Paper text:
Cas12g is an endonuclease belonging to the type V RNA-guided CRISPR–Cas family.
We observed a single Cas12g in the asymmetric unit of the crystal structure. Each motif coordinates a Zn2+ ion and is referred to as Zn2+A (HCCC) and Zn2+B (CCHC) hereafter, respectively. In the inactive state of apo-Cas12g, the lid motif is positioned above the catalytic active site, obstructing the catalytic core region and preventing substrate binding and cleavage.
Numbering used by the authors: 10 to 544, 622 to 708, 744 to 760
């Protein structure tokens, strides 16, 4: 039996508490002690980042031959899959030994152990034989004089940082990239009129302009050819300012028949005079008119100027505007097309291609842990801390400070409401980070997942969605493989007994549907607030509170009905450019982020409470809320 990969949903908790002055100690003592914690936090970031800078040079490069360094790369990241299960030592200790050999902190002697394959031994030699940058020599010169336990922690935190951020995202991207290429080739074979020559022509036009966006914010080629003042980008709501203004005038100051016919009578008036109006509206018109000239900032003189008596604005907002001139970008495109009338025909088809197939999905780039976002925490393990939950005091032994000696702090007491009380768990480690200038400590302890009735992991359902079937065009294949995996690993008759909560998120109201097998059993109230309310892409993140709070309601309702499976709805696919006022593409982008966040929190909690999660595609319809029940039938594949 070849050993299995570590879980991604970890069976562990960290409770974070503010570090406080210990009662009877000067603000100055605290400050000097907090200064020592800050220096150790920053040194730990420097050390992990240094290890990452060294390790990341051996990442496999897409579509290239495996380097001889690759086995060491794979092992550093996930040592457990290459070691014997009956190893007397931990994968963490084995990683330490491989790292020391590969970095020349030690020799290959430690690697004579049969725990290590020859492939590993050979890969580690290949790493050690390479010249080291000055930076790596400085890092290894420093780490050589650390205690083994601190080096082990460093290696573990760097390896886990790289594996969990970069490597998962890189593996998701590779499959996304591979399938995008197959979908591109098929779309091009099915639309052969968009030849390479034509694509190139448009590509060069959009480079010459300076359009780096997939989705071009430019009037259609053919609208642009009409040669009128009609852009959909220049105004507010695809009309001039005056057209918007007149609409407020018509709601605020006009009444009865005047709301309809004032525009018409004003143009009749301007061209042919008051006596051209019906006798019975001359009176009201006089008043409506001098009011009109005041609410807009218009003179009757200059209005008589245009086309023999015409108002310089639309009469409705429900019509294409002729007073809304084209943006400078609309006009440059128009200039490019005028010397290329051959391209006009293919404008729309080329923009469809450009939105999907001009740019490959972005290959992830390695990111270092951020000090300001406290991406990582300094680890104090077995003989480097003490905790007294009676007097809420903690001792933290810095790296070179002797055994039994601690810097001592109080901390915000463990809440009584917080379910694992210190006495019903064991603290394996304390984790130090800073939020701004303020020190925080995390008490780390193990909580096993409740066992699911499904003999399948959430990690398998995620791999189906992210690797096996990554494209939107593969949604149907994703849902079919997920349903099949879930039905085949449910112990009984899934179609009669599988307990499922469906919750419809987004522009489908706050309703949930409980199913037993394929049978809709009960609809349940669910009090969610929408993304419209509660109002460095931001830092006023009240999404996090929105996500945690709304996640908790979904989980309570699921647990209350001994649910096996939570089915979520993803957010509506992205509309085509134009009829997207800048503001509403920001608000659709906040929705997507916030909803991503609710799904992740519900998933993490669900796996802890012995459940599984599946996110179905946005309910595509072609006036009451049946939506959660429809979502469940979509899962079962009746719709
Ligand atoms: Zn335009
Ligand atoms: Zn208009």
């Amino acid at each position: 039996v070849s050993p299995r990969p570590r879980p991604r949903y970890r069976e562990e908790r960290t409770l974070v508490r503010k570090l406080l002055p210990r009662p009877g100690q000067s603000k100055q003592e605290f400050r000097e002690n907090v200064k020592k914690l800050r220096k150790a936090f920053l040194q730990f970031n420097a050390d992990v980042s240094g290890v990452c800078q060294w390790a990341i040079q051996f990442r496999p490069r897409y579509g290239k031959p495996a380097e001889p360094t690759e086995t060491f790369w794979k092992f550093f990241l996930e040592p457990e899959t290459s070691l014997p299960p009956n190893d007397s030592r931990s994968p963490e200790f084995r990683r330490l030994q491989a790292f020391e050999a590969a970095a020349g902190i030690n020799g290959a002697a430690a690697l004579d152990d049969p725990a290590f394959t020859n492939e590993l031994r050979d890969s580690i030699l290949a790493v050690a034989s390479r010249p080291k940058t000055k930076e790596a020599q400085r890092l290894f010169s420093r780490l050589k004089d650390y205690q083994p336990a601190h080096r082990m922690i460093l290696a573990k935190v760097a390896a886990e940082w790289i594996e969990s951020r970069y490597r998962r995202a890189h593996q998701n991207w590779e499959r996304n990239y591979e399938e995008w290429k197959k979908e591109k080739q098929e779309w091009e074979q099915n639309h052969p009129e968009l030849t390479p020559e034509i694509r190139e022509a448009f590509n060069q036009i959009f480079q010459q302009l300076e359009v780096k966006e997939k989705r071009v914010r430019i009037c259609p080629a053919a609208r642009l050819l009409q040669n009128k003042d009609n852009c959909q980008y220049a105004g507010k709501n695809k009309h001039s300012v005056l057209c918007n203004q007149f609409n407020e005038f018509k709601k605020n100051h006009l009444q009865g028949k005047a709301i309809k016919f004032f525009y018409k009578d004003a143009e009749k008036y301007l061209r042919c005079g008051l006596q051209s109006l019906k006798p019975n509206v001359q009176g009201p018109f006089r008043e409506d008119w001098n009011k009109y000239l005041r609410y807009m900032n218009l003179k009757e003189e200059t209005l008589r100027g245009k086309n023999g008596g015409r108002l310089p604005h639309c009469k409705n907002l429900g019509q294409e505007c002729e007073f809304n001139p084209h943006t400078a970008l609309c006009k440059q495109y128009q200039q490019q097309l005028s010397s290329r009338p051959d391209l006009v025909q293919h404008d729309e088809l080329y923009r469809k291609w450009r939105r999907e197939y001009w740019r490959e999905p972005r290959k992830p780039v390695f990111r270092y842990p951020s000090v300001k976002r406290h991406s990582i925490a300094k680890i104090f393990g077995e003989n480097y801390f003490q905790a007294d939950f009676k007097n809420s005091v903690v001792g933290l032994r810095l790296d070179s400070m002797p055994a039994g000696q601690y810097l001592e702090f109080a901390f915000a007491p463990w809440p009584r409401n917080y379910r694992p009380q210190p006495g019903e768990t064991e603290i394996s480690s304390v984790h130090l980070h800073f939020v701004g200038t303020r020190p925080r400590i995390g008490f780390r302890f193990r909580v096993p997942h409740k066992r699911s009735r499904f003999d399948c992991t959430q990690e398998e359902l995620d791999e189906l969605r992210s690797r096996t079937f990554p494209r939107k065009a593969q949604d149907q294949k994703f849902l079919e493989a997920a349903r099949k995996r879930l039905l085949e690993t449910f112990p009984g008759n899934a179609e009669q007994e599988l307990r499922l909560l469906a919750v419809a998120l987004g522009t489908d109201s706050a309703r949930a549907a409980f199913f037993i097998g394929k049978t809709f059993q009960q609809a349940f109230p669910l009090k969610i607030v929408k993304i419209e309310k509660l109002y460095t892409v931001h830092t006023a993140r009240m999404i996090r509170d929105w996500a945690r709070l709304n996640a908790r309601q979904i989980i309570q309702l699921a647990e209350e009905n001994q649910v096996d499976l939570i089915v979520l709805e993803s957010l509506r696919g992205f509309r085509p450019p134009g009829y997207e006022n800048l503001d509403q593409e920001k608000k659709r982008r906040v929705a997507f982020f916030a909803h991503g966040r609710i799904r992740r929190k519900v998933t993490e909690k669900a796996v802890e409470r012995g459940m599984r999660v599946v996110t179905v595609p946005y309910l595509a319809s072609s006036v009451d809320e049946n939506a959660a029940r429809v979502l469940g039938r979509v899962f079962w594949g009746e719709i």
